Amino acid sequence: PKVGILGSGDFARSLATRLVGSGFKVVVGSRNPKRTARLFPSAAQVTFQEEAVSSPEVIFVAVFREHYSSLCSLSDQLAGKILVDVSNPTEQEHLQHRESNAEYLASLFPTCTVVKAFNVISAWTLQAGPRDGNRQVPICGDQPEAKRAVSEMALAMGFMPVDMGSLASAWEVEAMPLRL
Amino acid sequence: PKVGILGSGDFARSLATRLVGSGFKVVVGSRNPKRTARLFPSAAQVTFQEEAVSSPEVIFVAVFREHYSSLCSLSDQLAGKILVDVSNPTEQEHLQHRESNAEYLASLFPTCTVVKAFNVISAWTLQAGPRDGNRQVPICGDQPEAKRAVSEMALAMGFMPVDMGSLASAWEVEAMPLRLL
Ligand SMILES: NC(=O)c1ccc[n+]([C@@H]2O[C@H](COP(=O)([O-])OP(=O)(O)OC[C@H]3O[C@@H](n4cnc5c(N)ncnc54)[C@H](OP(=O)(O)O)[C@@H]3O)[C@@H](O)[C@H]2O)c1
Ligand SMILES: NC(=O)c1ccc[n+]([C@@H]2O[C@H](COP(=O)([O-])OP(=O)(O)OC[C@H]3O[C@@H](n4cnc5c(N)ncnc54)[C@H](OP(=O)(O)O)[C@@H]3O)[C@@H](O)[C@H]2O)c1
């Protein structure tokens, strides 16, 4: 507790499932929480975006890059928080954009600290994937405290965090193939 | 609806998700509904086994073969209902048992009618939703009304039911490989 997630799709919902199964309290921010809540694990509290971001210290940004700027109205609430960029760009997106999605996200929310994590993990692995601790997540970011928070979370969820350095490493991390 | 599901695992949970996304009301029977409910889609009503099987006309049996007989105490409530055997046996289990899982389940609950369906569909395919051409669900069973009920459900979920005949076809259906991506 309390971990935030912005977004309502397959990845959001799988993250929520894993977090709840790992003893975290979870709040989800959706544009249509009424509709979205129906499919989410009951233990997660699905609410409006504004209200979902205010409590948590760590917020997973489980939306596509093209929708990042739509979150700008949440800036005053998000101030000083940890944002997790989970995006797994296609080969073409990766090559088209000079900066990583994670760096782009950092630029949009300069008062937040961004950690890149979970891009190489499938939604089904999140849902089902055995809590053997064998499955590696690469993790980077500029802030050691933020990286530790996300790494401990990864461990509690049964993954094995691998430190890949500063947020400048996010471009190479975003090139890593999704497993599997 | 309401559609029933017995069991609390990855498959139960995925079936539930999918059913609720397709406009069905869903009730789930678990031995520990307090714990189990936490992970299930909010729109599903997770409750005790006895209470779960009491309302619905069609009940998905999303537990392993080895646990089928543990459901015998529910016999009185399950009488006259449609049971869906979704099991995907391992090659070994398939070869060790003379009869199919579905036929075994039919023998345990003779006042019920069993339909074999969904064994070839992965839990993730249930969750994420089918997409072409990964839509095909083999169905068999002895009773045309029961097969129609399950087939319409399949169609509502976005699958394409394929009639494989009587419950005697279930052994061959159970040999069908499970499909992923
Ligand atoms: N699925 C995987 O196996 C996988 C693996 C690794 C990483 N990821 C990453 O997770 C992120 C989301 O993926 P997904 O598979 O969950 O996609 P998805 O199913 O399409 O979900 C996208 C979500 O974006 C949210 N969103 C917020 N603002 C939006 C807007 N303005 N327009 C459209 N949508 C908006 C939506 O929630 P609301 O409408 O309720 O706000 C929606 O649920 C992506 O960056 C992806 O690379 C996915
Ligand atoms: N997962 C897939 O991709 C896949 C695909 C097709 C078919 N299936 C089929 O779906 C069925 C279940 O699969 P699953 O992946 O959901 O397995 P699972 O995660 O192990 O779930 C089995 C469930 O059986 C229930 N159960 C009822 N009585 C039990 C007992 N006495 N002892 C132990 N468990 C008992 C449990 O729920 P409660 O504790 O609440 O009772 C448990 O959650 C299997 O026959 C499988 O072949 C799975």
Side-chain angles (χ1 to χ4, degrees), chain A residues 1-179, chain B residues 1-75 77-180:
Chain A
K2 195 105 145 164
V3 178
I5 301 166
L6 284 172
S8 315
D10 288 346
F11 203 81
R13 181 178 83 254
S14 305
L15 274 172
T17 304
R18 190 64 163 220
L19 285 167
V20 168
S22 306
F24 293 93
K25 293 199 183 169
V26 177
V27 62
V28 181
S30 169
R31 292 176 295 158
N32 198 334
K34 185 179 208 252
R35 181 198 238 289
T36 295
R38 295 180 71 260
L39 291 68
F40 269 62
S42 320
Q45 289 183 346
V46 180
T47 191
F48 303 91
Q49 281 173 340
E50 300 56 36
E51 282 68 53
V53 304
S54 60
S55 295
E57 290 174 29
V58 173
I59 294 149
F60 288 84
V61 181
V63 311
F64 289 98
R65 181 201 191 280
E66 47 269 39
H67 301 128
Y68 284 9
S69 61
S70 80
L71 302 168
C72 286
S73 51
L74 307 178
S75 301
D76 267 38
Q77 299 206 64
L78 289 171
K81 295 178 183 311
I82 298 173
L83 300 183
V84 192
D85 191 304
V86 302
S87 64
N88 171 40
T90 67
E91 277 177 338
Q92 169 135 13
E93 295 168 337
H94 176 63
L95 290 176
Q96 283 174 137
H97 302 296
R98 178 176 308 273
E99 69 192 345
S100 61
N101 294 350
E103 291 173 292
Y104 171 54
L105 189 67
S107 78
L108 289 175
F109 299 97
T111 67
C112 298
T113 183
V114 178
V115 179
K116 181 81 207 181
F118 291 97
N119 57 305
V120 306
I121 303 307
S122 77
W124 184 244
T125 294
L126 273 172
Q127 295 249 354
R131 307 179 127 276
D132 88 20
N134 286 322
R135 246 69 256 163
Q136 301 186 325
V137 197
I139 283 168
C140 65
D142 295 339
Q143 207 205 76
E145 288 96 330
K147 285 204 291 180
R148 177 77 58 101
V150 178
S151 300
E152 291 182 340
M153 221 168 258
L155 283 174
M157 307 157 73
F159 297 94
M160 168 61 40
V162 175
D163 191 345
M164 297 280 184
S166 72
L167 203 68
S169 299
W171 194 79
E172 304 98 288
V173 170
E174 281 173 9
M176 295 177 164
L178 180 75
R179 309 279 179 187
Chain B
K2 303 192 95 136
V3 186
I5 304 179
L6 287 160
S8 96
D10 285 337
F11 201 79
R13 181 162 63 70
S14 299
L15 276 176
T17 299
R18 180 59 177 163
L19 283 170
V20 318
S22 313
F24 292 90
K25 286 219 271 272
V26 181
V27 55
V28 178
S30 168
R31 292 176 293 156
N32 196 324
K34 191 188 169 186
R35 174 174 319 237
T36 288
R38 294 181 20 88
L39 296 181
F40 268 66
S42 319
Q45 289 185 342
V46 179
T47 191
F48 304 90
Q49 286 177 332
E50 294 85 347
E51 284 65 46
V53 307
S54 61
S55 63
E57 281 164 2
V58 175
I59 294 98
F60 289 86
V61 182
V63 312
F64 285 93
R65 186 190 165 122
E66 36 270 66
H67 299 138
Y68 283 4
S69 65
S70 74
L71 306 170
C72 279
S73 67
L74 308 176
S75 301
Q77 287 237 265
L78 290 165
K81 287 161 165 29
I82 299 164
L83 299 186
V84 189
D85 190 301
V86 301
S87 60
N88 168 40
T90 57
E91 284 161 305
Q92 172 170 26
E93 297 168 346
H94 179 62
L95 291 168
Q96 286 184 304
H97 300 303
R98 188 170 270 101
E99 79 302 337
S100 66
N101 292 355
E103 285 166 306
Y104 173 51
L105 177 77
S107 71
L108 288 169
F109 299 99
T111 64
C112 294
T113 184
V114 176
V115 179
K116 181 77 208 178
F118 291 97
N119 58 301
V120 298
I121 306 301
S122 70
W124 185 244
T125 295
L126 278 174
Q127 293 253 355
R131 329 286 298 293
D132 274 279
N134 304 49
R135 273 179 208 267
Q136 290 201 320
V137 183
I139 297 190
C140 54
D142 293 342
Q143 196 206 74
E145 292 89 345
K147 282 205 292 177
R148 183 178 291 278
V150 180
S151 299
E152 288 174 344
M153 233 174 265
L155 288 162
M157 298 174 263
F159 296 96
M160 178 47 62
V162 169
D163 187 0
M164 303 278 168
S166 71
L167 206 68
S169 295
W171 196 79
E172 280 145 323
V173 172
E174 284 180 0
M176 291 178 172
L178 174 71
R179 193 200 56 237
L180 300 173

